[PDB]
Amino acid sequence: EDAELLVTVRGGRLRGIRLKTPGGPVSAFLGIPFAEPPMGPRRFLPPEPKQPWSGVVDATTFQSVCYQYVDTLYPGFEGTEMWNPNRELSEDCLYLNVWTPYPRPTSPTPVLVWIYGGGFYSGASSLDVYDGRFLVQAERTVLVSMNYRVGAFGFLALPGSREAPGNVGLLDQRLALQWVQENVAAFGGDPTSVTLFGESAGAASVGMHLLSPPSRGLFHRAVLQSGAPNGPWATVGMGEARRRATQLAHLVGCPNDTELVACLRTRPAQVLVNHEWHVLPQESVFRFSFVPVVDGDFLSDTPEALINAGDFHGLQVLVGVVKDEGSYFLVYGAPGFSKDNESLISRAEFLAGVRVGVPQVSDLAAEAVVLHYTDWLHPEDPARLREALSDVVGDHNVVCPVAQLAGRLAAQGARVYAYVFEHRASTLSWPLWMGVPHGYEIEFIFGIPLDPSRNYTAEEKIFAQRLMRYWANFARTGDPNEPRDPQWPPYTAGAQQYVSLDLRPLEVRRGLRAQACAFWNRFLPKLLSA
Amino acid sequence: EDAELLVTVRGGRLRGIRLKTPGGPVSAFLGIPFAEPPMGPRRFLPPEPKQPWSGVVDATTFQSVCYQYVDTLYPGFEGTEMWNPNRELSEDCLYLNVWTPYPRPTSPTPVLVWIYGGGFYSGASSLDVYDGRFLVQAERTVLVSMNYRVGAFGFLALPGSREAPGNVGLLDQRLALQWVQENVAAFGGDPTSVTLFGESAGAASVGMHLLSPPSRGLFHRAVLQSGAPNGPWATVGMGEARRRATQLAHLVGCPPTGGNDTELVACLRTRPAQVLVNHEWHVLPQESVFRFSFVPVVDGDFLSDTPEALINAGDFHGLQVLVGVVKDEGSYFLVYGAPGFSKDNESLISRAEFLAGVRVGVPQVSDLAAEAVVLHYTDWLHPEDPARLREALSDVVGDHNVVCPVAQLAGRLAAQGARVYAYVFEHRASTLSWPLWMGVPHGYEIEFIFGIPLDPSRNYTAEEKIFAQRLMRYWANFARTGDPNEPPKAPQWPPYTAGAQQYVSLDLRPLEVRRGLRAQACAFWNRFLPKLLSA
Numbered sequence A: 001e002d003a004e005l006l007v008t009v010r011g012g013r014l015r016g017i018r019l020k021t022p023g024g025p026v027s028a029f030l031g032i033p034f035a036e037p038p039m040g041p042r043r044f045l046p047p048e049p050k051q052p053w054s055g056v057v058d059a060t061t062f063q064s065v066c067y068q069y070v071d072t073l074y075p076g077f078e079g080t081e082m083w084n085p086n087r088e089l090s091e092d093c094l095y096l097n098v099w100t101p102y103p104r105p106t107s108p109t110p111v112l113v114w115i116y117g118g119g120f121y122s123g124a125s126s127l128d129v130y131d132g133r134f135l136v137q138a139e140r141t142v143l144v145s146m147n148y149r150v151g152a153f154g155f156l157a158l159p160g161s162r163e164a165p166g167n168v169g170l171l172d173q174r175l176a177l178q179w180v181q182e183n184v185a186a187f188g189g190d191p192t193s194v195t196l197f198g199e200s201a202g203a204a205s206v207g208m209h210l211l212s213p214p215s216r217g218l219f220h221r222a223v224l225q226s227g228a229p230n231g232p233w234a235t236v237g238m239g240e241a242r243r244r245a246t247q248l249a250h251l252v253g254c255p256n257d258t259e260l261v262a263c264l265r266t267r268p269a270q271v272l273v274n275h276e277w278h279v280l281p282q283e284s285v286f287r288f289s290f291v292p293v294v295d296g297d298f299l300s301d302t303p304e305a306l307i308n309a310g311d312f313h314g315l316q317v318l319v320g321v322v323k324d325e326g327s328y329f330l331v332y333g334a335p336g337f338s339k340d341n342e343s344l345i346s347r348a349e350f351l352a353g354v355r356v357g358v359p360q361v362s363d364l365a366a367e368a369v370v371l372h373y374t375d376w377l378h379p380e381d382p383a384r385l386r387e388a389l390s391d392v393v394g395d396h397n398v399v400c401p402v403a404q405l406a407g408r409l410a411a412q413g414a415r416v417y418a419y420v421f422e423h424r425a426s427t428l429s430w431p432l433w434m435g436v437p438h439g440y441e442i443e444f445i446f447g448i449p450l451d452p453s454r455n456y457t458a459e460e461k462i463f464a465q466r467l468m469r470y471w472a473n474f475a476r477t478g479d480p481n482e483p484r485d486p487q488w489p490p491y492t493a494g495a496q497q498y499v500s501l502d503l504r505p506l507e508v509r510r511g512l513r514a515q516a517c518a519f520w521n522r523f524l525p526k527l528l529s530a
Numbered sequence B: 001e002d003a004e005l006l007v008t009v010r011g012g013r014l015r016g017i018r019l020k021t022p023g024g025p026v027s028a029f030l031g032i033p034f035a036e037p038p039m040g041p042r043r044f045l046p047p048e049p050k051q052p053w054s055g056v057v058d059a060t061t062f063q064s065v066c067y068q069y070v071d072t073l074y075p076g077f078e079g080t081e082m083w084n085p086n087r088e089l090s091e092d093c094l095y096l097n098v099w100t101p102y103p104r105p106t107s108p109t110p111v112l113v114w115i116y117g118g119g120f121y122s123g124a125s126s127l128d129v130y131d132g133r134f135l136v137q138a139e140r141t142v143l144v145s146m147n148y149r150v151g152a153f154g155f156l157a158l159p160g161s162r163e164a165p166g167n168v169g170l171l172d173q174r175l176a177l178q179w180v181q182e183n184v185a186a187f188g189g190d191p192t193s194v195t196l197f198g199e200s201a202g203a204a205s206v207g208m209h210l211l212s213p214p215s216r217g218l219f220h221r222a223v224l225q226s227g228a229p230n231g232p233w234a235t236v237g238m239g240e241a242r243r244r245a246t247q248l249a250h251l252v253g254c255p256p257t258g259g260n261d262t263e264l265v266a267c268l269r270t271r272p273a274q275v276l277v278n279h280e281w282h283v284l285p286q287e288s289v290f291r292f293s294f295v296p297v298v299d300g301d302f303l304s305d306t307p308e309a310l311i312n313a314g315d316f317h318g319l320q321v322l323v324g325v326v327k328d329e330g331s332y333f334l335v336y337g338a339p340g341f342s343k344d345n346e347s348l349i350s351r352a353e354f355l356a357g358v359r360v361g362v363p364q365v366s367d368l369a370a371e372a373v374v375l376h377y378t379d380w381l382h383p384e385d386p387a388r389l390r391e392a393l394s395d396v397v398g399d400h401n402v403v404c405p406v407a408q409l410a411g412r413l414a415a416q417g418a419r420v421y422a423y424v425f426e427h428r429a430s431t432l433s434w435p436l437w438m439g440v441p442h443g444y445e446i447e448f449i450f451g452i453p454l455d456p457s458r459n460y461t462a463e464e465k466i467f468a469q470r471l472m473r474y475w476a477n478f479a480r481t482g483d484p485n486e487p488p489k490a491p492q493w494p495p496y497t498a499g500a501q502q503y504v505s506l507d508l509r510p511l512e513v514r515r516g517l518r519a520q521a522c523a524f525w526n527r528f529l530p531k532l533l534s535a
């Protein structure tokens, strides 16, 4: 029996598993229960701590994926399947994973905690692209990731009610962060040095823990990749949350909040999932039905407000985006688009596309978008129109919300580092016109290219090693820089400096799409208020 | 007596003068009366045709300048004095001028008719810079120019009333064009080949004659230099014209506000001209630049609808037009009221001064509209750089007032049947007396078009003389054929179209073809901003 793989945590004993890497072994504890299964009467309710067990929990394999929608746009295609569930679906899904060096560290090791994205409707900690073995071996951190409830199960809200208060998937994450405070030392991790990192909805999640005081005591630094809590898709108001929940009930045959939730609780999980997309108020891309709700509790105001009004002295944050944030989303509803052709759209398609990519705004607002994103010397050129709509969706949903978070944090006391990720993976299965799409830096951060069974180049492995070092340096010190030799400067509201991350050495540049982001962040809100 | 210098027109006999030019003699008939003097009881009324006379009228010097405000912002400064009156002020000012080759043409000769600018408040056909002798000598056309009433005298309007109907300055212009039709053949001119040209307010006037059916039959082609009838300074609605007229009357003791129109006008007619002029600027609703108190009014009569609407809804088949702008349309206007600006320093303004200038440069729009302007013209990587802010405020004023109205006029006309040629004038005269930062300001192409550098007493370079000759040639080719191009190996000037949007650069170098008259910027002013204003 290997003693390195035996651990006692507050709730009882665990058996883990030794994993291989090209750099040597790592210890892993996968599928640890952190909450009571949120089943039956507990559906829609806040999570309860896992009660103590006797005997030894088998922590040698990933546990079930939280019930969610499964993508069928391109069956069998790698580019979509890599994001789909790779274990069975269950509502009994509240488990977390810990990776540690081998043998177990004997002194406090800095902790990275990963929160997955997936638009709050999908995702899992067990996805191959989130495999912690390479980061832990190469940079000698402890790495934790958790499952949290998604879709209606995590985010359906009838505000005011106790039977479905909203934001429970966020509370699933908080409970996991509390579990880390209490138990990570048993693995050699340092509870006083916990860095949160997430991508997309995971990044929006990280930002929400930043702005919610009960969460803020549970971690020390933050990394937000391609997402922000102030993104227009990342939260919903109380009124619209109630409407969507109420329409879900009607669509699955249920009728008083208490009677409504009770009827929802009698329905098979899969049935809720089958109607999820239909509660959206219009045809759209980059919009998701059940998301965090602003109701005074977890978030006392909108994240925008909380950001504008907060003191952030003592915080260090690492934020960034990929080169083509919008491109992936266009094939899920923009007319004329497909991964399987050049998507060289017409002006009419571009115009219809703007209403899909910027849903629920006035005609005037849409006209303003068309003005800023048309080249009036080439109003009808297909390739330029394809690129412009990509920019519309990407700027609106990701780039400009991240830029505004970065600007306001830096101006209000925090030290911020910014990047743009510009390398297109040699193995990418999406067409060339999509460039570097949403989600495709993650495999480089996790060191996935070091896996011998995969097809990355020698240069790509060295690049992954550089990225792993930046991220871990940031976790350990609040600063991604290596010892002096080109330096990564802090981002500020005036100079607006960030770096390009690709196979070449760091290049320092200015402005996260400043001209476009002035539109989304400064002008457009004024227009919408009048 | 010299037979070349004697001419009979419908009204009676005229005697003219022989002018020397560097290239040979020209005949000139300066100061020909074309209306009865709009004196006393006739103030604010439409022009009456000049009654026939016995004997011989000496048309041998320019007549008086129509009553107007005189610029004193920089006393004695050449850059401003060149625009100031160079004859005594009088309400007795409705005279026109003809220049013709010597000896008189044997076969009918194409006619150019000049309409001066000056914001509908100023200007005169007598200014040295509008001296027609060089064009006539060089290109052998006939050149006509007329005086027309400006300010309250030409454009005060109490809409509906017979006693001050408004637009009488445009009627002065039209009467002169009717005079050219009836009489130009006596000077050797061809009434079937008449080309109007004008700059700033004169260009906007030309555009209005295009959009008014009774004017349209009096000419065949048109040239619009740095102005357009659809410019936001060029016309005013009925209610605002009434408000401005009523305030003027109030400020000069009439009536002893509003009331009977007949009574109010009769009281205004008792005021000395200068008294009205001294109160002119006080009727504007806010502090501004590029705004003028008394301008043409849209009342269904001269203009049946806004110039914008008339342009959008017109058939322009059969029309050739030449349009253009100078390189720095906005700069001249900034030293007349934008915070931080002077001709005598670098005008390196702050951000706060920029923001304040936007409201002066784009007056009487909502706070939201002003915010949209600041969005478009701010470089968000350099939001506070003084030199860039100076250049941006110049662009705001120039785009809004001149470039974009001209672009819009050119695009609609091209799309709706007209042949259109467009230019940007990029040469800064060696003799220019305004500071370097102002670049090529509003009004500084005119001296080249008129061939002023050929004047020996002035100190232009030889290259500038060559340049002037090229320009005069393009303008006259356009007047003769509807096409400025030379009837070989020289670079061709292509037509302007709504899609390709091609124009040429006019400077000391050969023609260079470019695309788009500030396309990105003008899409803001012409396409988006009006939707914001409606909503």
Ligand SMILES: *[C@@H]1O[C@H](CO[C@@H]2O[C@@H](C)[C@@H](O)[C@@H](O)[C@@H]2O)[C@@H](O[C@@H]2O[C@H](CO)[C@@H](O)[C@H](O)[C@H]2NC(C)=O)[C@H](O)[C@H]1NC(C)=O
Pocket (backbone or CB within 6 Å): A334, A335, A336, A337, A338, A340, A341, A342, A343, A344
């Ligand atoms: C590129 O493809 C789009 C999307 O269409 C799908 O994928 C294609 C490879 C092909 O298999 C199509 O039949 C698929 O529908 C095309 O847009 C569609 O056009 C069809 C008619 O052919 C229409 O009925 C659909 O509604 C359209 N779908 C969308 C998403 O708008 C588009 O025509 C192709 N563009 C080209 C040829 O460049």
Ligand SMILES: *[C@@H]1O[C@H](CO[C@@H]2O[C@@H](C)[C@@H](O)[C@@H](O)[C@@H]2O)[C@@H](O[C@@H]2O[C@H](CO)[C@@H](O)[C@H](O)[C@H]2NC(C)=O)[C@H](O)[C@H]1NC(C)=O
Pocket (backbone or CB within 6 Å): B337, B338, B339, B340, B341, B342, B344, B345, B346, B347, B348
């Ligand atoms: C540049 O000039 C302007 C305008 O001022 C005129 O010209 C100057 C050369 C100098 O002779 C001034 O006295 C003239 O009035 C300056 O603007 C003014 O500042 C004063 C007080 O400092 C104020 O009373 C005026 O209103 C200002 N004029 C404005 C707002 O148009 C400007 O500051 C000068 N720039 C400099 C000094 O760099």
Ligand SMILES: *[C@@H]1O[C@H](CO)[C@@H](O)[C@H](O)[C@H]1NC(C)=O
Pocket (backbone or CB within 6 Å): B260, B262, B263
């Ligand atoms: C105004 O007064 C004059 C002068 O007596 C008179 O002739 C005219 O009809 C009056 N107008 C109106 C409409 O009262």
